[PDB]
């Protein structure tokens, strides 16, 4: 009945510094559908962010793609902050250029 989201944070194309990319947070495997997803730049929220339209898997669990346009640099953190009724604190997953 109720399930925990899983998170993948990653760029669209392999992350080369200085060149523009899209950032991706893929959440999936949760139930029910109401879920909050912020994309973060050094702790701050990214505002211009759209997302894919609700869908679900064989086992009935929901998935969503939150994406925003950006430009990687040597210095900046990025990450994905996720909350959902199954969680007790928001879930932040950092962005690794190798994951």
């Amino acid at each position: 009945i109720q399930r925990t989201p899983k998170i993948q944070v990653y760029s669209r194309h392999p992350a080369e510094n200085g060149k523009s990319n899209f950032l991706n947070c893929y959440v999936s495997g949760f139930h029910p559908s109401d879920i909050e997803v912020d994309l973060l730049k050094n702790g701050e929220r990214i505002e211009k962010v759209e997302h894919s339209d609700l869908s679900f898997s064989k086992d009935w669990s929901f998935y969503l793609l939150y994406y925003t346009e950006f430009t990687p640099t040597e210095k900046d953190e990025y990450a994905c902050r996720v909350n959902h009724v199954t969680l007790s604190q928001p879930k932040i997953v950092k962005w690794d250029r190798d994951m």
């Binding site: 194309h13 893929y26 139930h31 559908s33 609700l54």
Partner: protein
């Protein structure tokens, strides 16, 4: 791959914040072409792929008319299921449906499916004979009786899946072949990320491929390292294609002993 047309409804009751949320979406294979969100300002079923934006107003109005009537039907299902389970109007609840068809050659239906879910678990399901129903608890047996006495399965679901569904899959296929029949092989590669004195993580990549189906397999000089391989779930790029990777931690050097191999459609060779 074995082509498919599929629809996904999601119905969620917001208490007591007015009206139930409804979302339908369509997929030809791994490509989304339509959506309807009962919260959009449009009040209309909308396109999501370029290749379907050629269809006339008759399509969209035809489609918009229909999916509003489905939305009302699901809205009342929320309160019937809430009644069957002795649940209160205070709780939020979800109903889910998926139906669709796998294309067989010669323009034949190969497989039809249609299946419901209440609060994440199964509920009722059309079986593969297109006549019977599988009902997973007391509640859904109430639901079953009502659809047996009406012939829902054979009279309206068999019929839909055996003709409209099939014909229209072939219509989306033809009207969008430049995209839904284009082989897109993965740009594929490996990278090494050291860990210590001993170890080094080898990571085989595979980006920009269509459809989502794929296999990434590490070999230890001929032998599959599964299941010593970390394989992340196939994930969307955002541009209609997909990406995956598998990782294996090896003792350095001894990574010349290791090779990755990728099976996918777009790696066609006659």
């Amino acid at each position: 791959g074995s082509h498919s047309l599929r629809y996904f409804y999601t119905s969620v009751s917001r208490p007591g914040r007015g009206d139930p949320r409804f979302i339908a979406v369509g997929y030809v294979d791994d490509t989304q072409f339509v959506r309807f969100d009962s919260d959009a300002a449009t009040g209309r079923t909308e396109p999501r792929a370029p290749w379907v934006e050629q269809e006339g107003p008759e399509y969209w109005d035809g489609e918009t008319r229909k999916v509003k009537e489905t939305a009302q039907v699901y809205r009342v299902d929320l309160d019937t299921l809430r009644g069957y389970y002795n649940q209160s109007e205070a709780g939020s609840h979800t109903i889910q449906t998926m139906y669709g068809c796998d294309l067989g050659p010669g323009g034949r239906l190969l497989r039809g499916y249609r299946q419901d879910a209440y609060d994440g678990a199964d509920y009722i399901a059309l079986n593969e004979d297109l006549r019977s129903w599988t009902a997973a608890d007391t509640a859904a047996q109430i639901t079953r009786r009502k659809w047996e006495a009406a012939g829902v399965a054979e009279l309206q679901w068999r019929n839909y899946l055996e003709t409209t569904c099939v014909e229209w899959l072939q219509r989306y296929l033809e009207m969008g072949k430049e995209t839904l029949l284009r082989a897109e092989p993965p740009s594929t590669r490996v990278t090494r990320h050291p860990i210590s004195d001993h170890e080094v993580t080898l990571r085989c990549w595979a980006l920009g491929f269509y459809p989502a189906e794929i296999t990434l397999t590490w070999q230890r000089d001929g032998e599959d390292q599964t299941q010593d391989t970390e394989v992340v779930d196939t994930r969307p790029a955002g541009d209609g294609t997909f990406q995956k990777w598998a990782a294996v931690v090896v003792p350095s050097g001894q990574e010349q002993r290791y090779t990755c191999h990728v099976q996918h459609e777009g790696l066609v060779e006659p």
